[PDB]
């Protein structure tokens, strides 16, 4: 029952401030780099497809990674190990039956051992202090989709699509909260399918004006336009599926009409 809708939003807004990575964490990482982090995240999208994991699992996995890499320096040789263990943790939290650990060892082409995956798991829980219930863009989108007039499945899928692309690139997107990226994506996907705009329903709900959204939105617009030319492409391939109304076909609007 939407008796909790408002409490849950407010709570999620409170909790998303506590689960915020450091923004300049990549710059303080001596061996790893934003471009390698895109490779990892893109890989994890492919892992989600292979094992038919929820989108939320993937969103949770990437939150764990950014927070991990905020306290802990990690070497390229070991960045995949952090990601694997994050997906396992995400899967344990979010899905009904997670893939066995063995499967997670497999998807790295036995580059890491099972013991190593399991003991990095336990290291991610120490650094995160078991704080796994992190709000994500996916969660905020779901809350926003209740305020659509009318329900539009193309807009939802495309909003999900855009949300995912924001995982790939820390370069702009770590500065924005999951609720703001979700607001940008909802608007961008709404604008792209119908030409409509961030509804006044969600302006009062979130307290975000279209204009407060505009920095993140412009960034998200650039990413949408450049998406075909992007080195990483696991997400476009994902949303090419009819599961998703092939929204990653739909032609991005060359202007935002701001």
């Amino acid at each position: 029952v939407p008796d909790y809708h408002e409490d849950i939003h407010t709570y999620l807004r409170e909790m998303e401030v506590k689960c915020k990575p450091k923004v300049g964490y990549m710059k303080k990482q001596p061996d790893i780099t934003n471009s390698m982090r895109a490779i990892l995240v893109d890989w994890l999208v492919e892992v989600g497809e292979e094992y038919k994991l929820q989108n939320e699992t993937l969103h949770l996995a990437v939150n764990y990674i950014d927070r991990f890499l905020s306290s802990m320096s990690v070497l390229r040789g070991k960045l995949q190990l952090v990601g694997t263990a994050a997906m396992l943790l995400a899967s344990k939290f979010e899905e009904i039956y997670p893939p066995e650990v063995a499967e997670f060892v497999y998807i790295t082409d036995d580059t890491y051992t099972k013991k190593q995956v399991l003991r990095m798991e336990h290291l991610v829980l120490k650094v995160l202090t078991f704080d796994l219930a992190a709000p994500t863009v996916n969660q905020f989108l779901t809350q926003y989709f209740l305020h659509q007039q009318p329900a539009n499945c193309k807009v939802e899928s495309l909003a999900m699509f855009l949300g995912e692309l924001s995982l790939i690139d820390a370069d702009p997107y770590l500065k924005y909260l999951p609720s703001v990226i979700a607001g940008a994506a909802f608007h961008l996907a709404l604008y792209t399918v119908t030409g409509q705009s961030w509804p006044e329903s969600l302006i009062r709900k979130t307290g975000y004006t279209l204009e407060s959204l505009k920095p993140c939105l412009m960034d998200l617009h650039q990413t949408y336009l450049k998406a075909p030319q992007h080195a990483q492409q696991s997400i476009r391939e994902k949303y090419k599926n009819s599961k998703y109304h092939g929204v990653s076909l739909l032609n991005p609007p060359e202007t935002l009409n701001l």
């Binding site: 780099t33 890989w43 960045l79 995949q80 998807i107 790295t108 082409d109 580059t111």
Partner: peptide, 5 residues
């Protein structure tokens, strides 16, 4: 896949 970084 082993990731080449």
């Amino acid at each position: 896949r082993r990731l080449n970084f």
